[PDB]
Structure formats: C-alpha cells, structure tokens
Amino acid sequence: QNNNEFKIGNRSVGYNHEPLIICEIGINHEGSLKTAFEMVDAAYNAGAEVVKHQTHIVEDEMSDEAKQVIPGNADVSIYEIMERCALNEEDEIKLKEYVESKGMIFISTPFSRAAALRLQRMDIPAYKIGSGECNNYPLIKLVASFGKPIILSTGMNSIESIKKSVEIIREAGVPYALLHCTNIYPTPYEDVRLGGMNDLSEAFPDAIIGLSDHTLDNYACLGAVALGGSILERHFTDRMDRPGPDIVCSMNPDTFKELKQGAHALKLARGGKKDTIIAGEKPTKDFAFASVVADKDIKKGELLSGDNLWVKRPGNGDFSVNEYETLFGKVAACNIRKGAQIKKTDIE
Amino acid sequence: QNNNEFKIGNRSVGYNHEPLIICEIGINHEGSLKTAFEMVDAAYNAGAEVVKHQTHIVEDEMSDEAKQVIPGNADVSIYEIMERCALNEEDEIKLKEYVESKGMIFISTPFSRAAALRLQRMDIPAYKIGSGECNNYPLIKLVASFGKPIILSTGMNSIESIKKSVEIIREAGVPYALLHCTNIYPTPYEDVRLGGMNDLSEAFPDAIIGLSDHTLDNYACLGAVALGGSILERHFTDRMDRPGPDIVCSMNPDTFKELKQGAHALKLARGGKKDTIIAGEKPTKDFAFASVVADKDIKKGELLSGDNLWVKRPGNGDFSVNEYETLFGKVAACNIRKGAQIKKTDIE
Ligand SMILES: CC(=O)N[C@@H]([C@@H](O)[C@H](O)[C@H](O)CO)[C@@H](O)C/C(=N\O)C(=O)O
Ligand SMILES: CC(=O)N[C@@H]([C@@H](O)[C@H](O)[C@H](O)CO)[C@@H](O)C/C(=N\O)C(=O)O
Missing domain, CATH: 3.20.20.70 (Aldolase class I)
Structure with missing residues (x-):
C-alpha cells in the first residue's frame, strides 16, 4: 500500500x-x-x-x-x-x-x-x-x-x-x-x-x-x-x-x-x-493437480486423441493437464494401459 | 466497487x-x-x-x-x-x-x-x-x-x-x-x-x-x-x-x-x-465548527487584524473560521466587545 x-x-x-x-x-x-x-x-x-x-x-x-x-x-x-x-x-x-x-x-x-x-x-x-x-x-x-x-x-x-x-x-x-x-x-x-x-x-x-x-x-x-x-x-x-x-x-x-x-x-x-507463490502450498499442488492418463487401452501405433486421453490426480505425471491437448495426434509408441499415466516413452 | x-x-x-x-x-x-x-x-x-x-x-x-x-x-x-x-x-x-x-x-x-x-x-x-x-x-x-x-x-x-x-x-x-x-x-x-x-x-x-x-x-x-x-x-x-x-x-x-x-x-x-454528506452529522457541525470572534475590545473605526480577531465555537456566527482572514483590514463600524462574535454589522 x-x-x-x-x-x-x-x-x-x-x-x-x-x-x-x-x-x-x-x-x-x-x-x-x-x-x-x-x-x-x-x-x-x-x-x-x-x-x-x-x-x-x-x-x-x-x-x-x-x-x-x-x-x-x-x-x-x-x-x-x-x-x-x-x-x-x-x-x-x-x-x-x-x-x-x-x-x-x-x-x-x-x-x-x-x-x-x-x-x-x-x-x-x-x-x-x-x-x-x-x-x-x-x-x-x-x-x-x-x-x-x-x-x-x-x-x-x-x-x-x-x-x-x-x-x-x-x-x-x-x-x-x-x-x-x-x-x-x-x-x-x-x-x-x-x-x-x-x-x-x-x-x-x-x-x-x-x-x-x-x-x-x-x-x-x-x-x-x-x-x-x-x-x-x-x-x-x-x-x-x-x-x-x-x-x-x-x-x-x-x-x-x-x-x-x-x-x-x-x-x-x-x-x-x-x-505470490506460497511454499506451504507445495504439498497440495503435488497431490491435487491432475496429470494426463490413458482413458482406454491404446494399441501400439494408434493416435492419441481427446477420446482415449483424460486427466486425473495426482500431479507427478510426465504430462500435466496443461499439456493435455498437445498429445492429440501423437503416436502410441507401445500398448498403453487404460488408466495409466501417459509417459514420455509412450509416444513416438 | x-x-x-x-x-x-x-x-x-x-x-x-x-x-x-x-x-x-x-x-x-x-x-x-x-x-x-x-x-x-x-x-x-x-x-x-x-x-x-x-x-x-x-x-x-x-x-x-x-x-x-x-x-x-x-x-x-x-x-x-x-x-x-x-x-x-x-x-x-x-x-x-x-x-x-x-x-x-x-x-x-x-x-x-x-x-x-x-x-x-x-x-x-x-x-x-x-x-x-x-x-x-x-x-x-x-x-x-x-x-x-x-x-x-x-x-x-x-x-x-x-x-x-x-x-x-x-x-x-x-x-x-x-x-x-x-x-x-x-x-x-x-x-x-x-x-x-x-x-x-x-x-x-x-x-x-x-x-x-x-x-x-x-x-x-x-x-x-x-x-x-x-x-x-x-x-x-x-x-x-x-x-x-x-x-x-x-x-x-x-x-x-x-x-x-x-x-x-x-x-x-x-x-x-x-x-458524502451525512445528514446525521449536522447537529455536530452546528456546535463544533468555529466562528470568528473579537479577541479584544475593538474601538469604532479601528482595523480588524489577526491581532484582535480569533475563532471559537459554535458555528452560528456571521463569519465562519473559513472567512477568518477575509476580515483583516475591515473597519470596525462600532465598538466591538471582546469575545463577541463578529457580526456583518460590525464592519463598514
Ligand atoms: C486441494 C483440495 O482438493 N482441497 C479440498 C480439501 O477438502 C481437502 O480435500 C482435504 O484437505 C484433504 O486432506 C478443498 O479445500 C478444495 C475446495 N476448494 O479449494 C473445494 O472443496 O471446493
Ligand atoms: C465534535 C467533537 O468535538 N467531538 C468529540 C466528542 O468527545 C464530543 O465532545 C462529545 O460527543 C460531546 O458530547 C470527539 O469526538 C472529537 C475528536 N475527534 O473527532 C477528538 O477528541 O480528537
């Protein structure tokens, strides 16, 4: 003031x-x-x-x-x-x-x-x-x-x-x-x-x-x-x-x-x-922010879409909910299990 | 807001x-x-x-x-x-x-x-x-x-x-x-x-x-x-x-x-x-604001100055404390009693 x-x-x-x-x-x-x-x-x-x-x-x-x-x-x-x-x-x-x-x-x-x-x-x-x-x-x-x-x-x-x-x-x-x-x-x-x-x-x-x-x-x-x-x-x-x-x-x-x-x-x-970033909030961000997860089983070589992707807690995924749409069109580099977090190694 | x-x-x-x-x-x-x-x-x-x-x-x-x-x-x-x-x-x-x-x-x-x-x-x-x-x-x-x-x-x-x-x-x-x-x-x-x-x-x-x-x-x-x-x-x-x-x-x-x-x-x-003017304050203004009063006896024909004028409660005087300095140089139109409020008829 x-x-x-x-x-x-x-x-x-x-x-x-x-x-x-x-x-x-x-x-x-x-x-x-x-x-x-x-x-x-x-x-x-x-x-x-x-x-x-x-x-x-x-x-x-x-x-x-x-x-x-x-x-x-x-x-x-x-x-x-x-x-x-x-x-x-x-x-x-x-x-x-x-x-x-x-x-x-x-x-x-x-x-x-x-x-x-x-x-x-x-x-x-x-x-x-x-x-x-x-x-x-x-x-x-x-x-x-x-x-x-x-x-x-x-x-x-x-x-x-x-x-x-x-x-x-x-x-x-x-x-x-x-x-x-x-x-x-x-x-x-x-x-x-x-x-x-x-x-x-x-x-x-x-x-x-x-x-x-x-x-x-x-x-x-x-x-x-x-x-x-x-x-x-x-x-x-x-x-x-x-x-x-x-x-x-x-x-x-x-x-x-x-x-x-x-x-x-x-x-x-x-x-x-x-x-202002409050250090005391850090434990909350880590559990409460969402990460991108598979929404269905995705076969190796299939394209990632808004239809087989979603976002879930907690926040430690390779891809945050902020990058959700950047995964559309990526190619499944292996079989992806429904509900698993999308890993950097899951896409070509 | x-x-x-x-x-x-x-x-x-x-x-x-x-x-x-x-x-x-x-x-x-x-x-x-x-x-x-x-x-x-x-x-x-x-x-x-x-x-x-x-x-x-x-x-x-x-x-x-x-x-x-x-x-x-x-x-x-x-x-x-x-x-x-x-x-x-x-x-x-x-x-x-x-x-x-x-x-x-x-x-x-x-x-x-x-x-x-x-x-x-x-x-x-x-x-x-x-x-x-x-x-x-x-x-x-x-x-x-x-x-x-x-x-x-x-x-x-x-x-x-x-x-x-x-x-x-x-x-x-x-x-x-x-x-x-x-x-x-x-x-x-x-x-x-x-x-x-x-x-x-x-x-x-x-x-x-x-x-x-x-x-x-x-x-x-x-x-x-x-x-x-x-x-x-x-x-x-x-x-x-x-x-x-x-x-x-x-x-x-x-x-x-x-x-x-x-x-x-x-x-x-x-x-x-x-x-914003609050109607409820009006009784306070009337008693609490000051008015201009004689600070000494002033003889008819004497000049009003910062030396024979001052300001006192309450607020109903002819001259408010806001007009105090505007009375300097005015001519006493009659004898003014020490402590009396300056009246419009007290000056030529
Ligand atoms: C980060 C979070 O999800 N916090 C909620 C809280 O109840 C926690 O679950 C308990 O602390 C669990 O230990 C609550 O504060 C969130 C909220 N608005 O912030 C709302 O419920 O709308
Ligand atoms: C208008 C005024 O003079 N009000 C004062 C108050 O005690 C009153 O005398 C009693 O209500 C009398 O009935 C006081 O509020 C003023 C002040 N600051 O406003 C201060 O004392 O510094």
Whole structure:
C-alpha cells in the first residue's frame, strides 16, 4: 500500500507497522481525576499503548453562544457539558504523569488555542485534531508550529477542505495522519463508508491513514485494518455502566483486547499479491493437480486423441493437464494401459 | 466497487447484495450419512443458507499414483482418505434432499468428470471448482457446459493461469465468481494476502469476488467483506471435537453466527465515498465548527487584524473560521466587545 511512517514518542506508526489503537478517554471521566485514573488503570491492564485525553478550556473554546446549543448525544448545552467534564491544568498534568507512570503514551486533543499552548508546555509527543477543528485553519496553524506530528480527524469535511489543513501541516514540516471519521454518537454501520479511507490516501499520498470510530462495536475498526489502516481510535471506558455522552460507543478492556487481537491478525493477512507463490502450498499442488492418463487401452501405433486421453490426480505425471491437448495426434509408441499415466516413452 | 451479480437458485450474490457464507461440509462427515445429517442440522439451526459438499468418485478422480502421495494435513495417502470419506451416489442424493428439506441450497465440488456428471443428474443450481482443479481446463470445460454458474477457487494458480479457466467459462456463457484462496490447512494469517482479491477483480472486471479460507478463525473472512468480498467459504462442523483433516479450520454454529453478524455489519460499512454528506452529522457541525470572534475590545473605526480577531465555537456566527482572514483590514463600524462574535454589522 505505502511506506509512510512516523514516530509518536518511541512508537512507529504506518502501514508496515503494527496498527496502533488509541484509547480515547476524552470526557469519559466526567471531570473526576479519580475516575480518570480508574480508566487509565483499565487501559494499561488491557495492554493499551496510548491514552488520549481532550483538553477543554471553556472560555477560550466557546463564545457565549455555546451556552445555547445542544449536541446530538446530550440534552444540555455543549458549554454545560464541558464545564462539568473539563480538567483544569493542574489535574490534567497529574493525568499525563499517571499515564506515563503506567508506561503508556499520553496525547490529547486541544479544542482551543489556549489548550494547544497548555499541551505544548506539557511537551506531549503528538497532537490529535478532532473533526470539529479540521477546518479551524488558525488552530491547525498554531498546533503545527509546535513541531510534533499531527493526527487529524477528517469527519464533516470534504477532501477539498482537508487539502487546506494538509497544506498548513506540510508547510510546518511535521508528519501527519488522516483519520476517516463520522461524527454521530453512535454511528450506524451504513454511515461509516470505509471507502472514505481510500479516497483520503489517494488524495494525500504522504499521509498515514486510519479510522476514528463511533459505532457500537469493533467491526468498522477491523475493516479499517484490512484496508490498510494504521491508527484505530475508539472511546474507552473501564466499564460500560458509567454515565456520559460518549460511553455508549466506547471500548472496555474486553473489547479493546478483541480489537487488538483482530488488528494483529488483519495486519498480517492484509495486502500482498495474488501471484505470490506460497511454499506451504507445495504439498497440495503435488497431490491435487491432475496429470494426463490413458482413458482406454491404446494399441501400439494408434493416435492419441481427446477420446482415449483424460486427466486425473495426482500431479507427478510426465504430462500435466496443461499439456493435455498437445498429445492429440501423437503416436502410441507401445500398448498403453487404460488408466495409466501417459509417459514420455509412450509416444513416438 | 462493481454491480456484478448472478443467482444461485433464488439467492442473489454480488457486491450490492448480502455476503453469502458457504458452509463447506466437504469430507467432514467421514463417510457417514448420519454424521453428515447432524452437520446439516447444525448449519440450518445456525441460520445457514448454503451447504457445500465434495463429490468424490475415487476411480475417476485419481490414478493408482494417488495411493502413494500424502496430503499436508494427513499421514495416509490421499486415495485412502477419499475412499474412507466418499459418499456413494445413493447417499449423496439423500444428502441433497436433506439439505433442501431444511430450506437450504445444496451445491458441491466435483473432483472428476464422473462426479461432474453425477451432479448434473442431480441438477444442482451451481458448481464449485476447488483450487486443485482451477487449472484442470478439461474439467472446467465439462462443468461449464452444464449451463449453471461457477464459483472458482483460485489458490495455487497465477492470474495468467486463471485467465485460461475464465476464457473457457466466458465461452460457455455462464456467470462466475472467483474466490481468492490459500491451500494450507490451516493457513497462517501471514499467507492470506487479502490483496489477492483486488488483483483478481482488476484482472477480471466481470467476476463476483470472494474468499475461500482455511485460517483458524473469522478475521480473514471479515477483512474480505470489508474489501468488497461477496462470497465467504469456510469449512463447517457441528462440533470442534470431530475427527478429520479439515475439522481444525472449520466454523461451528457459534463462529458461523459471529461471521454472519460481522459480515452484515461490514457489508453496510464498506465502500462509499469520503465526500458524502451525512445528514446525521449536522447537529455536530452546528456546535463544533468555529466562528470568528473579537479577541479584544475593538474601538469604532479601528482595523480588524489577526491581532484582535480569533475563532471559537459554535458555528452560528456571521463569519465562519473559513472567512477568518477575509476580515483583516475591515473597519470596525462600532465598538466591538471582546469575545463577541463578529457580526456583518460590525464592519463598514
Ligand atoms: C465534535 C467533537 O468535538 N467531538 C468529540 C466528542 O468527545 C464530543 O465532545 C462529545 O460527543 C460531546 O458530547 C470527539 O469526538 C472529537 C475528536 N475527534 O473527532 C477528538 O477528541 O480528537
Ligand atoms: C486441494 C483440495 O482438493 N482441497 C479440498 C480439501 O477438502 C481437502 O480435500 C482435504 O484437505 C484433504 O486432506 C478443498 O479445500 C478444495 C475446495 N476448494 O479449494 C473445494 O472443496 O471446493
């Protein structure tokens, strides 16, 4: 498919690498550092490599108008949700320390210029840009100036609109990933459009490609791996009974493990070429391919035809089924027994 | 991807249709009609649509040489295995009746001219050609002359060698499917090469494409569906404790159900285009996209710049983040409050 790659800290990502699953804790902690640690514990214990946060600074993120608009997966204003769920700077730094104390990589999504500057102070190794900000070219400009790789979600945006984001990113000189995304919580299977991934890699041949997902299970992400996806993002919770607008579409430890196992299998199985000769098939070819045999007794001096020849397993005959018709007209050099393989010495 | 389609009895197959899972009972019954019925029962009860048999007539299938060659997944000769497992004509007809008495479609793979003629007498609705016979052009010629659709496995064969089979098939005028296949029992993930499927559809634009699989689980088949596969073939047993060389890589009722559910999800999610506008995302765009706001108090008559402007959620401002730079140089038509959205009436 391609050889694009970059590193997130010590983790290589790309088509030739192991798919990377991002455990998006997001606002799932509902503003409680204690709940956030219980979720980081759950991710570590499940074998997680990366925990992603969301960095919400409500005042720099939203004008007063946001106190009057309700998201699709809630019944109160987006401002109220973020005020309730937002971790302040001190707590978020505690979160990063904790994630790295568990040997995992901490990254986050900034929703504001100020959140972007807070993450730079923390020196995070890579930046996620959510689909809501994929057309926020001033924010992308700022983040790209930090000099770290960017993982850009591309939901709600056209290839044309994404080109503008990618130009900014290329200008800064940082490697980037494009995640295909549908921003409905949860997302119906029929809206996922995994082909969107090929559209993206075709439009932007230097991007690492993956999927951010909000369906109820792992199937979309597994198909993304089969298609060449290198990064998989789902929401993550320690248990499904938690409250929160994103919980519904989250992995838990069990389904994270399933996805990790499925992704590993599909990383190995995907790609390659039809014509590749697999040494392991050799014993099968030898017994299963057919060879040319006499279909009747043939007297010395008789002509071989489609009437006294046929083809039978196994494949070790002097003449393969591929040469069947080349024996028509040959002269029987001796008596040929019905059912015997045609030998080179059976014809003049 | 494409609109190729044909019918197997009353079942449409093709990219625009529900993926079809073929429950390959094969030689799993070990020659016992009783065991074969217990497996047909298990398939029906799991929701199976198709049961595939193998039609073995040892004498027309193999010359005496087959009594000296051992398959990869056994330790006795291929002739011994088939002698032990082969159902005679009377029993195989009982098998077909039974499968159809359960409302399922019966098809089979012939390994010989005589088996092909036996299946024509039974008037089966479609023919499977196993990879061992994909280069048996005389057998393909015979089967194609029956006038039913053909599902051709293509393991162990090059695109070039398959062209010869497909030419024969086109000549007869029957629609066909090509199943990508690796004939190692079981098959390692790393040998599956799901890309082989795209190679096939590219070489043969009129073929229905699918996967015949011999890995230990469902992941290969799920990736095949994400790639556009229309037919999925695995071996099938009622329970994993049975004896037989193909049991190891078979579905049972539980894993058949998982694959059926995964295939349905991936049929809905696959394909499509990145730029498609999903009505369900509309509430997210409205709250998540940014609008241009004042970044400081701006006095009437002052110029708007990148220094007194910024962008914040939500998206209902007079000026979107896409028009941010078009406001530079505009003249403040009144005093503008820090944090207020820029209104059309705020500029001269
Ligand atoms: C549109 C948006 O901002 N959606 C984020 C989500 O948590 C929502 O805030 C909750 O649904 C609020 O109800 C998240 O999906 C964005 C993202 N990538 O798309 C990232 O966090 O990188
Ligand atoms: C090479 C071959 O003949 N393989 C068949 C398999 O059952 C073997 O007989 C057992 O492994 C014997 O040990 C089967 O895979 C072929 C097929 N499509 O490939 C079909 O039946 O249509």
